[PDB]
Ligand binder design. Structure first.
Ligand SMILES: CC(=O)N[C@H]1[C@H]([C@H](O)[C@H](O)CO)O[C@@](O[C@@H]2[C@@H](O)[C@H](O)O[C@H](CO)[C@@H]2O)(C(=O)O)C[C@@H]1O
Ligand SMILES: CC(=O)N[C@H]1[C@H]([C@H](O)[C@H](O)CO)O[C@@](O[C@@H]2[C@@H](O)[C@H](O)O[C@H](CO)[C@@H]2O)(C(=O)O)C[C@@H]1O
Ligand SMILES: CC(=O)N[C@H]1[C@H]([C@H](O)[C@H](O)CO)O[C@@](O[C@@H]2[C@@H](O)[C@H](O)O[C@H](CO)[C@@H]2O)(C(=O)O)C[C@@H]1O
Ligand SMILES: *[C@@H]1O[C@H](CO)[C@@H](O[C@@H]2O[C@H](CO)[C@@H](O)[C@H](O)[C@H]2NC(C)=O)[C@H](O)[C@H]1NC(C)=O
Ligand SMILES: *[C@@H]1O[C@H](CO)[C@@H](O[C@@H]2O[C@H](CO)[C@@H](O)[C@H](O)[C@H]2NC(C)=O)[C@H](O)[C@H]1NC(C)=O
Ligand SMILES: *[C@@H]1O[C@H](CO)[C@@H](O[C@@H]2O[C@H](CO)[C@@H](O)[C@H](O)[C@H]2NC(C)=O)[C@H](O)[C@H]1NC(C)=O
Ligand SMILES: *[C@@H]1O[C@H](CO)[C@@H](O)[C@H](O)[C@H]1NC(C)=O
Ligand SMILES: *[C@@H]1O[C@H](CO)[C@@H](O)[C@H](O)[C@H]1NC(C)=O
Ligand SMILES: *[C@@H]1O[C@H](CO)[C@@H](O)[C@H](O)[C@H]1NC(C)=O
Lengths: 325, 168, 168, 325, 168, 325
């Protein structure tokens, strides 16, 4: 007698949207926008370093809080909020661009720049860099007269980049608390530092004066840097106010000292080495099957696309047509 | 007690297939899923979701800072990031709507494919009833239904019987 | 003096409906709009325009200045604003083209829906003439036409008459 | 005998475009791109202020032209072209970012910062700020020696933000026309202003000298500002060249002194309180049913999307197939 | 030795047309391209490529420099240019996929248009065989085939012969 | 007996992609992404200038290497890599924005600014600008005392833009190698240059000192510019260190000295006047039928859209369904 053709249905289906229409009911659907993150940085199978209190620029010059990261090796570099790049007050020139460099280095290697000295005080210290006792940047030397109010010598230092990787070279300029204090440490006269590369040439004079007291000190130390091509010499020339480099920084993704290319994330979250993750934000990790996320615009790494919507339901079966009596 | 096909109705009782046959003859009623045309629908729909990733996933790094802000440059970065977000939000939403139209339409197509298959298989031995069903004008037992279902029905075997039932 | 359906022609004289029937029998000619299938087309098309707003409208503020310009930053803002404009111009133009394809196609679908409805309603009492028309093989007065139009035509009432006119 | 199915047609229809084809003729169509604006700012049901000649930064310090807007309350703030933020020549530091603040405040409230003085001239005036007679910024005090060539005292002022909303605090540095004129007004010596917050600390010295004459004056006054968190003190310390704040500015969207969040537009158009509008540009208002506009890229508020095209015709009925003989 | 139409198969031997007829009668076999419905497919596909240019081409100038770089501003220009590139890459890829779906579907439509044309032309003188072919129930010589091909077949001439072959 | 309908097929077709599916085989296809460029700048039917060694800013001031381009007329302007805008070491203020101007000028016209002098040396030269003998910028005059260590006069120069096009006016400030050398050339005292327009007013003092030796010279010359509206006067006032303009630059797209609007490209490629091209990059020319290119993101002119993909195959015929036995 008779044969019918047909398709399945269910009692309640889920509403999706099409180009034409809104709220079409289908048999099956799945979400496409991830709203839920993993509140941990997931480092499983990655080499990670939590810098904790150590600001990342600190791993180059070496304040007390960065003592465990002077040479470090990492695929994933985690910066924290309360972190500080310095002890003795002052800041880096063109900092934000030096960070982005260290963040994607894979870690930094350190080597001694060879400098020796004569008839100078090179062991200058500060209650601002305290270890067991007043100390100073582990990778820098503070250079003073060796006798108070003695005038400081005119000196030249050269260092030549031997390695096939470009070198990070940092130096500082000390800004005394007043014109009196500069005289005490470097003597009277005109103070001039000049730094010369084959691409770089700048000169610096201290600007002494009463600044607000930070970390107990009214003086400042300002750091500057340059990238030194292989086979190139940097020339240091100075008669005072000079914070000199004792080691040069070499990136590890330029070399078994090698460790290719890192991602630097900024996060407030505990590390978890048990979960796997490729995309990170300040709350932790996004690890989802879904193509989009609503969690954070500023996620970094291998990430779902950020979208304003918290839901975009995708159909996985046909339009649901309920059965009739 | 009567049976109707897809043109009015979906079937809440077809629970092991997407598409299927429902029949009626002296033996009684029956329902059977259809594997081939169900699987062909499922095949086109698995692999969605993965295709949304291929098309919209990316690799990037930090360009502004959260723990120490970089303001003139930062007020434009915020504005450009927000602008790109609106573009990608429009795009994602459009992509899902497009994918959804395609799922709904492809499912309709496998149902029509299958009905057209059976229509052209019954030839002149049957007539469309309007509800997605064929009224068959010969005596069609359970092993003849399966004949229609597995695509081995020989319309010639039953043609003369059908035509004496159709015309008179 | 002859009548033809949609397969060749649109009807300039159908002025109170989108879709409709035109007929011919002893009584003479007639035309009637069809409310249900006209309204279903209209329903899918009202709400366009509003949907173009939902999808493409936004909220923003000033980032550059017209009465006192902010030049290095301003030459990139101008360049980024112009770039975003080209993206949104491509998008708007694509959205309208897409919406337009959908209007034209949905209208074609309601015409075919309706013809398929009448075809399956006349069963074996009628034959397709190729121009969107059915040649009816029984005598079909004005109150039988309305029967076909309002979907209450009982094809059995007229079947034997039709088949003696069809075959001989 | 016979029944046909069919659809309507019209004699001439309008051309639209599809993805596939160009110039398809349909029965009905509507434009989607708005090309025509309303040459008025439409403020119906909004609280608007036309600042006219008053530049918006002027509502903080208070030149003669801003006298009616020192405290003001607005959802919609209209800036004009010929407007000036000052009378006595000089400019604001980081101005563009102070504007965007006042533009979205909902209006500003003013309160007295409490400062009193001793043995100083505090009533300094200028032919540049004329009211009935030579005058000065209504919210500032010009501080001079009280006797010509007398040296100016070393003074400290503190103000503490009491309110739960952050405070706008403005101050100025006067730059005399020559080294002679500075001596007349503040006396000889080194002139230094220092401003101290818990987040802010800057210091300013006058740079005296012959500048071009603007508004009849070759001196300059430069204004600076800061945002003061609740329960925080600003510290003023200075021995001359100081233009002091007499009132602090508080935003109204931070408080019935309250008026949430404003939109600041720049427009050349008359106000019309009879029309309603949400989107504005320099020629007036865009109020359209249409989803796109071709009028101005730089429109602000709740706006149709700007597009390069002046026409994108949308179909509202079917493809038009003319009847055949 | 047997012939089948499009429902199973494409024809590797149709080398002067896109669409066509293949026939069988006492005279023997034959194949003929169809000009009108081939040209209509070709017309909709030429002009692609040009339409991809209209929709996606532009005019711009230098905003950064290669022989002397302009770094804070330049690190955002690089980032914004890269972001716009991803948008346009998503758009181009989507546009081609869309155009490709439309080519494949329009070609299917001209094949179905043409089969529906022939079906409604043969009326009751022929029956669908399921493979894209019509079994014709009268004697149909080479000059009657051309009649069906050039759309001048008068189904009435052959109707009674067909119906005595169809029913008995 | 029987008639079939059908469509063509071929034995192997090419794979394309649709929205739904990947690798659908069609009968015919074409590439849409251009990967191959023309390694030449194609100037057929355009007026081009290869500046070669001449940096584009040099066409204004006129070092030896720009001698053939002081007045030039071009639709297409090609800059090279090793190019230099100067001879005597120093740089332009706001350079990148002066380049973009000259690049889209259509060429520059030059006219004499009328200046004459009295009791000065105006023929200053330098081994840095060598022609037949030590020379100087062809469009500038170096102004010195006329007797060593004589103090340099206080002088005023005015030039008024007569033409209906805005004028390019360049000037320089000489920075002597030491305070001694400044005294030799301009005499002792305070050195001040002031430049005054109706929109522009700036002043410049030399900053003398030992810089590194470039092109054999430790001094510097720094150039500055302004755009002068029609009917406006620039006022030069100076008592030393002044590099004066001898000719003003007028753009040709502002005028048969006329030549509308140019495109400036930067390219490493030989010129070819036999091929036609509208889109250029550093490797040459893109001239393609295709709507997209994968060659270079930074192409300029009338260009295909750049995309990351190296292939997006477009279908030009139907889905290929091979014939069955
Ligand atoms: C290398 C050296 O002399 N280091 C000093 C250091 C410097 O003298 C000073 O910071 C230059 O800015 O100052 C140290 O602290 C001292 C304080 O204890 C003191 O009470 O004030 C001093 C100046 O008046 C000086 O600040 C320091 O850094 O802690 C002592 C250190 O030996
Ligand atoms: C507080 C005070 O002394 N105000 C003066 C003001 C200042 O002396 C001066 O602007 C500092 O820049 O100058 C006033 O105008 C004067 C002119 O009338 C005059 O012809 O030149 C004076 C200096 O030589 C001074 O500019 C002013 O602002 O109008 C007078 C005012 O009392
Ligand atoms: C106008 C003039 O005096 N030009 C000098 C020029 C300037 O004196 C100097 O460059 C200012 O920066 O210097 C010229 O070269 C000289 C060298 O030959 C010399 O060995 O050192 C001189 C200073 O000690 C001076 O540099 C030059 O530009 O070549 C000579 C020229 O006449
Ligand atoms: C119906 O859709 C659901 C998705 O909502 C599919 O189920 C997922 O199936 C995979 C494995 O098949 C699991 O990993 C997921 O966890 C399931 N999702 C959830 C959240 O349950 C299911 O396969 C689809 N089935 C049909 C027949 O459509
Ligand atoms: C045909 O399209 C027009 C739009 O061009 C529709 O008319 C608009 O109708 C609304 C109310 O229905 C009015 O507010 C508008 O002003 C009309 N627009 C204009 C400019 O006239 C009309 O509804 C459509 N009718 C059909 C049957 O398609
Ligand atoms: C098949 O597609 C090809 C494109 O691959 C078409 O051939 C191009 O044809 C134009 C002129 O017709 C020539 O300028 C091109 O050089 C050809 N392209 C190449 C690379 O060969 C051809 O027209 C299409 N033919 C059909 C019937 O589809
Ligand atoms: C159909 O049935 C007839 C009955 O004779 C038979 O000869 C034939 O082989 C059957 N199969 C097909 C596919 O025709
Ligand atoms: C159709 O017509 C027949 C005539 O007997 C009648 O019995 C039947 O109820 C009608 N209605 C339907 C829907 O079959
Ligand atoms: C069809 O054939 C019949 C045979 O009599 C003839 O009268 C008629 O004119 C033919 N043409 C059409 C289009 O009906």
């Amino acid at each position: 007698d008779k044969i019918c053709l047909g398709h399945h249905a269910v009692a309640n289906g889920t509403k999706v949207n099409t180009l034409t229409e809104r709220g079409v009911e289908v048999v099956n659907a799945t979400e496409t926008v991830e709203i839920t993150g993993i509140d941990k940085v997931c480092t499983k199978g990655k080499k990670a370093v939590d810098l904790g209190s150590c600001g990342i620029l600190g791993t180059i010059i070496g304040p007390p809080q960065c003592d465990l990261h002077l040479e470090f090796k990492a695929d994933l570099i985690i910066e924290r909020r309360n972190s500080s790049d310095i002890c003795y007050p002052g800041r880096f020139t063109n900092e934000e661009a030096l960070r982005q460099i260290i963040r994607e280095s894979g870690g930094i290697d350190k080597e001694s720049m060879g400098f020796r000295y004569s008839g100078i005080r090179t062991d200058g210290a500060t209650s601002a860099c305290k270890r067991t006792v007043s100390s100073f940047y582990s990778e820098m030397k503070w250079l003073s007269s060796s006798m108070n109010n003695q005038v400081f010598p005119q000196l030249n230092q050269t260092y030549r980049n031997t390695r096939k990787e470009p070198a990070l070279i940092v130096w500082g300029v000390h800004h005394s608390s007043s014109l009196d204090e500069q005289n005490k440490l470097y003597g009277t006269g005109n103070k001039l530092i000049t730094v010369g590369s084959s691409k770089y040439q700048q000169s610096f004079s201290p600007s002494p004066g009463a600044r607000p007291k930070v970390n107990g000190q009214a003086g400042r130390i300002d750091f500057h840097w340059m990238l030194l091509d292989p086979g190139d010499t940097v020339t240091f020339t100075f008669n005072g106010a000079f914070i000199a480099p004792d080691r040069a920084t070499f990136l590890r993704s330029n070399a078994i000292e090698y460790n290719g290319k890192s991602l630097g994330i900024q996060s407030d979250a505990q590390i978890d080495e048990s979960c796997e993750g490729e995309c990170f934000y300040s709350g932790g990790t996004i690890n989802s099957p879904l193509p989009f996320q609503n969690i954070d615009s500023r996620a970094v790494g291998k990430c779902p696309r950020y979208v304003k919507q918290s839901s975009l339901p995708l159909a996985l079966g046909m339009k649901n047509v309920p059965e009739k009596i | 007690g009567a049976i109707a096909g897809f043109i009015e109705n979906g079937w809440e009782g077809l629970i092991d297939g997407w598409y299927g046959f429902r029949h009626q003859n002296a033996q009684g009623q029956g329902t059977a899923a259809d594997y081939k045309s169900t699987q062909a629908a499922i095949d086109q729909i698995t692999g969605k979701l993965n295709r949304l990733i291929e098309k919209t996933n990316k690799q990037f790094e930090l360009i502004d800072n959260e723990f120490t802000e970089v303001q003139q440059i930062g007020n434009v970065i915020n504005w450009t990031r927000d602008s790109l977000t609106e573009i990608w939000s429009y795009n994602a939403e459009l992509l899902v709507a497009m994918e959804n139209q395609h799922t709904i339409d492809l499912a309709d197509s496998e149902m029509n494919k299958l009905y057209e298959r059976v229509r052209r298989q019954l030839r002149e031995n049957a007539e469309e009833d309007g509800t997605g069903c064929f009224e068959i004008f010969h005596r069609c037992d359970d092993q003849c239904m399966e004949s229609i279902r597995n695509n081995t029905y020989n319309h010639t075997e039953y043609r003369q019987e059908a035509l004496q039932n159709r015309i008179m």
